[PDB]
Design a protein around this ligand. Sequence first.
Ligand SMILES: Cc1cc2c3c(c1C)C(C)(C)CC=[N+]3c1c([nH]c(=O)[nH]c1=O)N2C[C@H](O)[C@H](O)[C@H](O)COP(=O)(O)O
Ligand SMILES: Cc1cc2c3c(c1C)C(C)(C)CC=[N+]3c1c([nH]c(=O)[nH]c1=O)N2C[C@H](O)[C@H](O)[C@H](O)COP(=O)(O)O
Ligand SMILES: Cc1cc2c3c(c1C)C(C)(C)CC=[N+]3c1c([nH]c(=O)[nH]c1=O)N2C[C@H](O)[C@H](O)[C@H](O)COP(=O)(O)O
Ligand SMILES: Cc1cc2c3c(c1C)C(C)(C)CC=[N+]3c1c([nH]c(=O)[nH]c1=O)N2C[C@H](O)[C@H](O)[C@H](O)COP(=O)(O)O
Ligand SMILES: Cc1cc2c3c(c1C)C(C)(C)CC=[N+]3c1c([nH]c(=O)[nH]c1=O)N2C[C@H](O)[C@H](O)[C@H](O)COP(=O)(O)O
Ligand SMILES: Cc1cc2c3c(c1C)C(C)(C)CC=[N+]3c1c([nH]c(=O)[nH]c1=O)N2C[C@H](O)[C@H](O)[C@H](O)COP(=O)(O)O
Ligand SMILES: Cc1cc2c3c(c1C)C(C)(C)CC=[N+]3c1c([nH]c(=O)[nH]c1=O)N2C[C@H](O)[C@H](O)[C@H](O)COP(=O)(O)O
Ligand SMILES: Cc1cc2c3c(c1C)C(C)(C)CC=[N+]3c1c([nH]c(=O)[nH]c1=O)N2C[C@H](O)[C@H](O)[C@H](O)COP(=O)(O)O
Ligand SMILES: Cc1cc2c3c(c1C)C(C)(C)CC=[N+]3c1c([nH]c(=O)[nH]c1=O)N2C[C@H](O)[C@H](O)[C@H](O)COP(=O)(O)O
Lengths: 183, 183, 183, 183, 183, 183, 183, 183, 183
Amino acid sequence: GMRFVVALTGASGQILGIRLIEKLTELGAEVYAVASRAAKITLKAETDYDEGYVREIATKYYDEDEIAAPFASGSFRHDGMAVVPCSIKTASSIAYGIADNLIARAADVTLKEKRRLVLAIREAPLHSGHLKTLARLAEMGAVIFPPVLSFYTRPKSVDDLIEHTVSRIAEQLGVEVDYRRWG
Amino acid sequence: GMRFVVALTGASGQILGIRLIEKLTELGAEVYAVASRAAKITLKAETDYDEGYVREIATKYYDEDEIAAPFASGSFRHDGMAVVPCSIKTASSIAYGIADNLIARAADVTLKEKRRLVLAIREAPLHSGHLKTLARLAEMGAVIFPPVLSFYTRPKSVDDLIEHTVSRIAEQLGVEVDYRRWG
Amino acid sequence: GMRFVVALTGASGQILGIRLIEKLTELGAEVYAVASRAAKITLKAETDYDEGYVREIATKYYDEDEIAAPFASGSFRHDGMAVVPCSIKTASSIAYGIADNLIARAADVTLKEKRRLVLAIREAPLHSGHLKTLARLAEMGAVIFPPVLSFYTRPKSVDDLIEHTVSRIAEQLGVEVDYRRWG
Amino acid sequence: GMRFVVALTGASGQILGIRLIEKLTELGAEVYAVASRAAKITLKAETDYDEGYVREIATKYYDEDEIAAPFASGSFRHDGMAVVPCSIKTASSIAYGIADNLIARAADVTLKEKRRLVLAIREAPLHSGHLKTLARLAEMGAVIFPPVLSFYTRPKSVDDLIEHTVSRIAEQLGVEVDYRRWG
Amino acid sequence: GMRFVVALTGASGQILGIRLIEKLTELGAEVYAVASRAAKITLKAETDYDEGYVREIATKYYDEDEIAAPFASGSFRHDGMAVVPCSIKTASSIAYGIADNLIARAADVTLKEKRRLVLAIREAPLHSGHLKTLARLAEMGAVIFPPVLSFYTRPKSVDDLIEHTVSRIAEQLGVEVDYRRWG
Amino acid sequence: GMRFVVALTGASGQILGIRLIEKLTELGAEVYAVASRAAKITLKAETDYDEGYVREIATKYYDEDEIAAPFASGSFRHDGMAVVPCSIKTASSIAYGIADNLIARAADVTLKEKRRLVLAIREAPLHSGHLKTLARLAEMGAVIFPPVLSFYTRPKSVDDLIEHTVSRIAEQLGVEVDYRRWG
Amino acid sequence: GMRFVVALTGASGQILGIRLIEKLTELGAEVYAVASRAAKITLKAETDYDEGYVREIATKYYDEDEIAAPFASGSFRHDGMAVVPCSIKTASSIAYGIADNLIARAADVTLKEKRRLVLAIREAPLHSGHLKTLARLAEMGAVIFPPVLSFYTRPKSVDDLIEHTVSRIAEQLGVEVDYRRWG
Amino acid sequence: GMRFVVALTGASGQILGIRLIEKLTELGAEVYAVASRAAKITLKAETDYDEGYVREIATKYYDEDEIAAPFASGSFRHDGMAVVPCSIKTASSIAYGIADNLIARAADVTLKEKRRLVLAIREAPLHSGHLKTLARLAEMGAVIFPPVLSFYTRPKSVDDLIEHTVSRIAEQLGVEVDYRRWG
Amino acid sequence: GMRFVVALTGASGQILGIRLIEKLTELGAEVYAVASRAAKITLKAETDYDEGYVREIATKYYDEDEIAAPFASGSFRHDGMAVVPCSIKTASSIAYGIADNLIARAADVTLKEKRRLVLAIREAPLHSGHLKTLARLAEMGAVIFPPVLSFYTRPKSVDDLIEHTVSRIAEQLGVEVDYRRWG
Ligand SMILES: Cc1cc2c3c(c1C)C(C)(C)CC=[N+]3c1c([nH]c(=O)[nH]c1=O)N2C[C@H](O)[C@H](O)[C@H](O)COP(=O)(O)O
Ligand SMILES: Cc1cc2c3c(c1C)C(C)(C)CC=[N+]3c1c([nH]c(=O)[nH]c1=O)N2C[C@H](O)[C@H](O)[C@H](O)COP(=O)(O)O
Ligand SMILES: Cc1cc2c3c(c1C)C(C)(C)CC=[N+]3c1c([nH]c(=O)[nH]c1=O)N2C[C@H](O)[C@H](O)[C@H](O)COP(=O)(O)O
Ligand SMILES: Cc1cc2c3c(c1C)C(C)(C)CC=[N+]3c1c([nH]c(=O)[nH]c1=O)N2C[C@H](O)[C@H](O)[C@H](O)COP(=O)(O)O
Ligand SMILES: Cc1cc2c3c(c1C)C(C)(C)CC=[N+]3c1c([nH]c(=O)[nH]c1=O)N2C[C@H](O)[C@H](O)[C@H](O)COP(=O)(O)O
Ligand SMILES: Cc1cc2c3c(c1C)C(C)(C)CC=[N+]3c1c([nH]c(=O)[nH]c1=O)N2C[C@H](O)[C@H](O)[C@H](O)COP(=O)(O)O
Ligand SMILES: Cc1cc2c3c(c1C)C(C)(C)CC=[N+]3c1c([nH]c(=O)[nH]c1=O)N2C[C@H](O)[C@H](O)[C@H](O)COP(=O)(O)O
Ligand SMILES: Cc1cc2c3c(c1C)C(C)(C)CC=[N+]3c1c([nH]c(=O)[nH]c1=O)N2C[C@H](O)[C@H](O)[C@H](O)COP(=O)(O)O
Ligand SMILES: Cc1cc2c3c(c1C)C(C)(C)CC=[N+]3c1c([nH]c(=O)[nH]c1=O)N2C[C@H](O)[C@H](O)[C@H](O)COP(=O)(O)O
């Protein structure tokens, strides 16, 4: 019984976090989901998905102000956290300890207990301040995963690209996943 | 009359560099194109595009061993260079001065003459060694542009995503471009 | 048609940002204005200016929670941003990527697209943590402009000092301005 | 007449800040107290203390949003500030200048005026990002005081341990205190 | 059959290392114990525990001068090492390679073979030299665990606090432990 | 079924990589082997081993120009990579991202996916540039293993020394191995 | 009997390396010469010198792929190495250990054995990446000698300038040379 | 109407600054010239040029003690500054803010207003202290241009070499210049 | 008459230091020998050599507590020092100035007087803390010589390998030695 935290933050690519939650659920893991306010605004602008769809597919759902949620403490056990998509604001809050909501605090707790943390950073260009922040995060142990376009799987629709990226992110959580791979 | 260097290297996303060459050509700029050996191998694996298609659409074409090409010198004038897609190997060669082919040397010449250089870095995850390299490149003046998935334009096919990313890369070259933007 | 973002934050010197908006408007530029909550509190404590005066003189006005404003995306074009006056909190939020309101996000977008950003940092003393933060911002490309007393123009009232400083800040935005200068 | 700021933040150990306020009050100093929202949530979870008990024992009480409180300016005189207990979020906000509430701003003002600041950092483990943050704070002049278990005083109850730690923290404020010490 | 090294050094909190040895023994692991000279002096000052009690409860006991003990070589297999409590002197000896007794050498061997090392650093305040040392240790892979007071488990005696801290340290060794946790 | 990449590069000690391949094969793992051009030149100068012996004992063999080999992508799964012996050129290519052949690219892919990478660096003296490079590699997660003479196993021939070193390198891959160890 | 390695690389100023070889030969030293492929291309573009002239005047000549040449090992004795002219690519390959041809490997061997290495770096402008590379090389012990125009010797032809620069480079090899000097 | 500051300092190569002033004057720009005391001493030792020749060809001339000259203030507008030739002393004074004469102050003013500054650094060898200084200057935005010998234009006299170098320096000022270039 | 200090410390490879003493004695130099306590323990475990054999073959012998030995002062002249084999503990003591015995103090005196110091560091793996320590030592001027296996001399017994390594270490002391070398 593996349990994972998945957080959606206010960057483009809300569909990536929704699909990661669906895949991890499919594979029989529990997912504790958190969506920030900005992620809900982006979901509205970006998709037609029901505003309560994330709460629907998650094992348990928390809003970003639920700072007393169970995984706000390192004494609560789980197997890893993914922030997908991850804004610069959340990546930077984690990097520098500005743990002022449940998402940043849960990620900080993941890092201090040396559990796996995967950040699907979505921003471009990245300036030297961003890059130093990501380097600091990498030093702290986080997996830095820009959700880059990939074509070696020969994708034909947007869902093809989403599936490849979501699969590759799941592997960063230490998950055996079935998907097209390079041969 | 604006002239730009566009280099394709051995990362996934060959279509991005092809389409950037087409767009810049459409807008009436000259494009001096270079494709590395690994980029030609990737083009073959990734697309069905004619092996000589890049040479076709470019104003002038060079192979990566043409180390005496005109823009290998800073005394030759041009308005900027883009490496799309950019492998870790080429980004790192530029960062550390291992200018052992035309692509890395042309980018180094672009940087030392303080012209615009845009690197469409495609790799994920990025480890701390990659991130320090990109930070060094940013300090040298390069634009670091991971070709990240974007959805706020509400894309419906793969060509939609390619067009947004290619447009955003063109803007990093100081180019006025017409495309859907955030409102 | 040049467009500029001007943000007021919670430091003393609200009059400096008001007057910069008036000058840029005088010269025929559009100004997109943002005032933080703390800046509105300071305006009340510091001036007798109408609480809606900034909205009056601006081309378009946004509150700091309007995180979906047009210049929250790099695909929206403008010619530069000034934060006048700039608190330590906002300068530091920009430096470290804590882009949790429209002001910090707009400034981050200005920086990543290599547009001009001018920060009228008002704090004294500056401790070593402040100075490292400002050095980081300078490395990212921001103009660091403490609004220092100046006397070589032989000022005779408070408005004289404000005019010199506002003029010098406008020049950091790449603006031709008419004012008394050193001969 | 010595005056001290004491701030409680959202880490375990609310009793430590309550008892420091009582001791400083006992010794005839004035205490200006601030409790963050998260500290009030923790107090509720951790103790049975009256929700208004801190306001009761303090000379003057402020909530964390009272950003215009007197010690938000360096022109207001006081003799030092202690944050007890201090969360990672508040320590990091101080370190990097994210002075977005009264607690972080008051501590920043304490530091820039070279007054004494004592941070009772309570977190374990501390990862390399935390440690770099604390090192930065130490460079800025803050006293870093993890509220560690101590046994050389031969404590027999929880109140014994609290008294030793609160006494040692008071000494970091430059306070003569009477307590059991090593001989 | 899991085997762990537990070292006691000359900081207050000898009871923490004794209790960790008891817990790991309870759970059926072997414990190879080492106590430094200063730890024996502190045990005498701090407790009433028999001077040979550590040797009693350990699977095998070594004094700090037994520099040829089996785990002084990386070719000897074990599952992790904890130094509880850890003095500044021992943490710093490990950080900088001054491996002049069995404790520092065993910890260095743990680190170079990328096994788990947990350091229950007990000192307060920590000055900037201490913090840089701990940051270096964190970079080398050590878990830095100040044995901080914790109250969210609502402890009622000194043994309550010791049990929480010892449990949390055991978890840093990768040990499944049964104890009260945050909900 | 565990699979490992083993690469031979152009440093003295070709026998070490041959014997590691034999041991891993003996223990029932698959080995994907790569030998650089310089390693083949060194093999000829150093041994009498058949030029195709490495291809013989490997599960699958690749030359260093086979940049499209399966483990050039992180989507291909394996359990670790060893470069034995490792030249300064290959260690430095990995450190700085100059991933211009299959060996450096495979090692970079191993690192970015946080798999185990062991580098049997053979050079002496090591100057400060080498040492900074190895420190960077260590930060990226690589195991740095100079193949140093060892005598505590009381070796009597050259094969004794090779067996100890090859065994110790195998352990860095997370392999249970049977060999003489310190007692 | 003093022996020196002189390498020509692909920067302008091939005449400088030819003349250094002639001078050292004149003074009765042996010169082991290496010319890279790019240096041969530059010689053709830059001079009318016979393509085999360098091999003619050298004691022994090697091409850059002769990676098994005697001075590829530190056990081979010589008195110093000069790279004249030195490209950014070769200087950077030496700095970062990318010793992928005889020139970079011979220079690395010179450095690790603490012999004299003189690099006649010819590039302008030098960007911050170049300057950090040269600083690293200087730390490793290399002499950094940009072949700058000099006029205090009152030169009257191009050969006058070449003679001054070649003489000054020879002195960096620890060679007594007769030439016009400042008085 | 473009205006440029050109400063001559006490390094060999006075002819380079004289010729740059002539070229910029030829092209119809105004040149504000400054010569240091050491540059006048070098001019005397190096050339036969009239001691007042620089004042003759300049639009306006200043001695280095004219610290109140117009471009000692950022409020005075100009289009860039070149120091040709630039001594280590002047480059270092600019780098570290020792702005104790008009040349260093004018260059500092050029940098703080983000105008173009080109430093024709003439010294060889450059030790690690020089290289760190130049790297700092590059970070501040200065163009670092060692006046290196160049031969790809196939120069035949000293004036040929001077013309190439002066032309290349003019291009660093953002000047369209007509000269032989690489093809 | 050349005099050299040779120190044996508590790492495997005692035979290397014995043989270096024999070779230097053979060549007619004086050797002042020091063996640490741990080196004597290792000699016993590792060899059958007489416990007083080192004292026998040395010109003069000192134990590590003879802190007043002649070469504990820089005013005593000698030609270099080798620590063979060198433990991490001794290398680190030298690096950081923990000069608490004759070996570390003699090496520190060697370094401050800019005499040659060669450290035959024997440890593997080397973690990032070790590598930073060795880099610091290299910066201080020490020769870092891991006693790596070497095969290009085509060794046939253990004594063959020892002779090559001892010869190469002697060369780092500036000693002309006769041994098989690369051709
Ligand atoms: C409303 C909004 C916010 C964007 C945004 C967009 C919009 C509409 C888009 C979709 C229009 C284009 C881009 N966005 C990104 C972005 N931040 C970021 O780092 N990456 C992004 O891709 N932001 C900023 C982000 O939402 C703010 O920085 C929030 O404070 C982030 O807070 P959070 O991490 O807690 O969700
Ligand atoms: C053949 C090949 C090379 C991939 C590659 C792929 C293949 C088939 C894919 C498409 C299968 C999956 C990924 N690839 C990337 C990659 N390098 C990189 O940094 N990003 C990539 O996305 N590489 C490595 C790259 O081609 C080598 O590092 C080259 O030496 C790069 O040289 P270049 O910059 O001169 O083109
Ligand atoms: C209410 C308030 C806030 C002052 C302040 C004052 C008051 C009354 C004064 C006018 C009384 C004296 C000084 N002030 C400054 C200050 N922050 C700063 O860096 N520089 C200042 O000059 N602050 C702090 C500031 O408003 C808080 O740090 C906000 O969180 C800043 O948030 P903002 O950047 O989003 O506006
Ligand atoms: C609700 C809550 C928050 C804990 C917390 C706990 C709970 C219930 C406990 C008591 C259950 C276990 C641990 N806690 C700590 C913690 N932050 C920290 O650095 N140290 C802590 O000891 N946090 C996080 C903290 O409250 C958030 O990071 C706040 O944003 C801090 O904001 P503040 O500094 O303004 O109070
Ligand atoms: C005797 C003694 C030593 C204390 C000490 C105390 C005493 C009596 C107390 C209990 C009275 C109060 C504090 N102590 C600590 C301390 N070192 C440290 O970093 N943390 C401590 O908590 N020390 C110092 C320590 O014992 C010396 O630094 C030893 O050299 C440590 O050596 P070790 O790591 O090998 O045991
Ligand atoms: C031919 C050759 C190359 C030696 C070498 C030798 C020879 C004959 C010896 C065996 C004679 C003595 C030493 N060697 C080493 C060496 N590089 C290194 O870092 N460590 C070595 O031990 N090199 C250099 C190496 O082969 C070149 O640097 C290659 O470019 C390395 O490329 P590779 O990593 O792709 O194999
Ligand atoms: C063909 C060629 C290459 C120039 C060059 C020129 C040409 C024609 C000139 C003569 C036209 C103008 C300038 N050049 C220089 C240059 N590299 C450099 O750092 N400094 C130079 O002065 N290069 C680049 C160089 O040759 C490539 O970077 C090679 O990969 C260097 O490889 P090498 O060090 O092994 O010779
Ligand atoms: C008199 C004098 C000064 C030389 C000099 C020469 C002479 C005669 C030469 C022409 C004989 C050979 C070299 N010179 C250089 C030099 N400084 C430097 O960095 N590069 C040089 O090329 N100097 C030093 C320089 O003039 C002093 O450092 C001044 O203080 C520089 O001050 P300035 O920048 O204000 O002019
Ligand atoms: C007893 C002993 C100590 C080994 C050791 C061995 C044994 C038996 C072996 C031979 C069994 C395996 C490895 N050893 C090494 C080692 N230290 C080190 O850095 N490299 C080594 O190769 N050590 C540690 C060393 O002796 C201690 O760190 C001493 O404090 C070093 O002190 P010294 O430098 O003053 O001699």
